[PDB]
């Protein structure tokens, strides 16, 4: 199936100008789109992601959404009716702890929906460099009706 990939593998390392914001937006308007998000792991390279945090911790089952001015956590399967999560990605747990999450959008989406993931490395400090904050935005428009 058609797959969209957000890969932060190298984009969040501490830098002089940091902390910077790297935004990865995925626009989905067709059925059976697979979204793959790759966020670096603590320890993948030493000292670079010591204080990295993923949000929501329980992604992709839980996601972030911005109702007006407030950011809130919500279940994706309740945000998009009929969406299902598989607990594994290629025989590894489907969780940011393993570095990668994936979800396939359902054949029918009724209402437009925006949700976010955060791969925040801003609390890690190498020399006077500070890590960056990675933001994934998934913009789903209605399709299949």
């Amino acid at each position: 199936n058609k797959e969209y990939v957000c890969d932060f593998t190298d984009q969040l390392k501490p830098t002089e100008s940091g902390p910077k914001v790297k935004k990865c937006e995925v626009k989905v308007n067709e059925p059976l789109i697979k979204v793959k998000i790759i966020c670096p792991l603590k320890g993948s390279v030493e000292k670079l992601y010591d204080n990295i945090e993923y949000v929501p911790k329980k992604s992709p089952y839980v996601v972030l959404t911005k109702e007006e001015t407030k950011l809130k956590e919500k279940l994706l399967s309740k945000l998009i009716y009929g969406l299902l999560i598989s607990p594994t990605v290629n025989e590894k747990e489907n969780n940011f702890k393993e570095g990668v999450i994936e979800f396939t959008l359902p054949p029918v989406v009724h209402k437009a929906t925006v949700f976010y993931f955060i791969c925040d490395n801003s609390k890690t400090e190498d020399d006077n460099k500070k890590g960056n904050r990675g933001i994934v935005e998934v913009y789903v428009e209605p399709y299949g009706n």
Partner: single-chain antibody, 233 residues
Framework: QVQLVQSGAEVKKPGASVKVSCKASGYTFTSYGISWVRQAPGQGLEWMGWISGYNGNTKYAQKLQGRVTMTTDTSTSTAYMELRSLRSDDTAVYYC??????????????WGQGTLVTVSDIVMTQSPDSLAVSLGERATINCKSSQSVLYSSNNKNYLAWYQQKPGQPPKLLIYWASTRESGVPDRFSGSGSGTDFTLTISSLQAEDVAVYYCQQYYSAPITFGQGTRLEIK
């Protein structure tokens, strides 16, 4: 009105091929998929593969890779399974079951009646192969998975329990390891987390005589326990 109607039983010489059909009705075919499960006589359940109802994409079990082909006919809501180079150990009842638009997300609630074909990885281990209990007494069945099936993102065990009575496909009793399917009596209880799970049947009745299976839908391939036949002492 979900229904899955399969083609009739066939006898085949070794080395030939067989194509089983599965006609679906009562739901939107393109929003779901079909999984195929086979059952050798008096033995357990093996997952053969999955096919999308939307685009015909397939996922096959490596065990059968090369010999099995799955196809769909969207206009007729029909799924097909062809098994090639039949061996004697391919003798089994072949079942179609409705699946979700991705495999490995939920267990099987709706099944076909099965097709008998006669030819002339997470491991699930269920403790007692056979069990005899007295009327009114509780029976306990254990299931151990070789690795944890608890998903950290939702704190749910991707573990299911089935009841198969003679002549019938397996019936889903419990999913999430403790949640009863609609209509399932409260005397059927599921418990456990991680790798160790238990099915408890209190106040055993004659209607409970059957074979019981556990199943993980945590990671492909889908795998079942070997089955626990329950008789009355």
């Amino acid at each position: 009105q979900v229904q899955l109607v399969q083609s009739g039983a066939e006898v085949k010489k070794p080395g030939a091929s067989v194509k089983v059909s599965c006609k679906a009705s009562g739901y939107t075919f393109t929003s779901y998929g079909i999984s195929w499960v086979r059952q050798a006589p008096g033995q357990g359940l093996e997952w053969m593969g999955w096919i999308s109802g939307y685009n015909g994409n397939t996922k096959y079990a490596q065990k059968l890779q090369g010999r099995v082909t799955m196809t769909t006919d969207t206009s007729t809501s029909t799924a097909y399974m062809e098994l090639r180079s039949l061996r004697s150990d391919d003798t089994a009842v072949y079942y179609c079951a409705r699946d979700k638009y991705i495999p490995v997300a939920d267990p099987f609630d709706y099944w076909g009646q099965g097709t008998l074909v006669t030819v002339s990885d997470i491991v699930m281990t269920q403790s007692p192969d056979s069990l005899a209990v007295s009327l009114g007494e509780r029976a306990t069945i254990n299931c151990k998975s070789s690795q944890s099936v608890l998903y950290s993102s939702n704190n749910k065990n991707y573990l299911a329990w089935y009841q198969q009575k003679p002549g019938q496909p397996p019936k889903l009793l419990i999913y999430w390891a403790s949640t009863r399917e609609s209509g399932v009596p409260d005397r059927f209880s599921g418990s456990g987390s991680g790798t160790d799970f238990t099915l408890t049947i209190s106040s055993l009745q004659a209607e409970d005589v059957a074979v019981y299976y556990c199943q993980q839908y945590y990671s492909a391939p889908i795998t079942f326990g070997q089955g626990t036949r329950l008789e009355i002492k």
